[PDB]
Structure 1
Amino acid sequence: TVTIRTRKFMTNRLLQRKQMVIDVLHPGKATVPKTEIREKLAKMYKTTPDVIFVFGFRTHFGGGKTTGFGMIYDSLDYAKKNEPKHRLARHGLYEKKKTSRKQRKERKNRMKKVRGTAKANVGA
């Protein structure tokens, strides 16, 4: 029932990707979740859904149409080479460390108190 059109489509030889703005037509139902657009474009461009990085979806007032933005890469080695790692963590293939930005700074200057190899001892 959902239809996808492609707009502003252009390939990137400088980044080994193709990029286009997506608009989905979903009249009467919720805005389609991002994981589902992946395979629908995979059926569209004859690719695998895991190399499909879409984001930036925001439905218009009144519903029925949601304009999103998507990337399609040449291969998975690229999709991990040139990609914001936060967008990789959307797919569970990347997971950042669990140190709050505050705790890294108390540990930073507490090592500034000591001089030499004893810098690794102050941390924890």
Structure 2
Amino acid sequence: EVCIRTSQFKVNKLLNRKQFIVEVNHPHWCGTVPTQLIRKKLATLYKVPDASQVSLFGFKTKFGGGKTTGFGLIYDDLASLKRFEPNYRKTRMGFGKARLPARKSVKERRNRNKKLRGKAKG
């Protein structure tokens, strides 16, 4: 029974997307509204072929309750989303690259090879 309002709408043909601010109102909830529920409702209201092509982030619940605000992007294709999205945002949504090993181990390995020459290097 939540209501979604969209403000400051713009069309980005450079990155093949639409960016807007999404506001959500509700009367009483068992905590916070999950981002997936807003994603499902946003797809229905905007009539997109697939709900897995709208990304939401940065949600702030107002003091007193009954209101949240955030940012959202709707991509024209699923391929556009998989290309222009940051690796951390797409990791929340399911499809992301594996986390690289610890940076400390890279620094020690790189410095160790600085003394060698030719083979036995990488």
TM-score, L = length of structure 2: 0.92
Q: 2:99 aligns with which of 97, 111, 119?
A: 97
Q: How far did 1:55 drift?
A: 0.5
Identity among equivalent pairs (%):
51
Q: How far did 1:116 drift?
A: 1.5
Q: How does 1:38-77 map to 2 (within 5 A)?
A: 38-47=39-48, 48-77=50-79
Identify the residue that residue 81 of structure 2 maps to in structure 1: 79
Q: How far did 1:31 drift?
A: 2.1
- Gaps (5+ residues) in structure 2? none
Q: Deviations along 1:2-55, whole A, 9 cap, x unmatched? A: 110011111101110001101100222122111221111010111111001000
* Range that drifts further, 39-48 or 111-120: 111-120
Cα distance change of structure 1 residues 26 and 117 upon mapping to structure 2, 3 Å threshold: farther
Identify the residue that residue 37 of structure 2 maps to in structure 1: 36
* One-letter code aligned to 1:118: A
Length, aligned pairs only: 120
The DSSP-based 3-state class of the residue aligned with 1:8 is strand
Q: How far did 1:114 drift?
A: 1.5
The DSSP-based 3-state class of the residue aligned with 1:102 is helix
* One-letter code aligned to 2:26: H
The CA distance in 1 between the partners of 2:119 and 2:34, in whole Å, is: 51
* One-letter code aligned to 1:13: K
- What RMSD, in angstroms, separates the aligned Cα atoms of the two structures? 1.2
The CA distance in 1 between the partners of 2:103 and 2:37, in whole Å, is: 33
* Range that drifts further, 32-41 or 66-75: 32-41
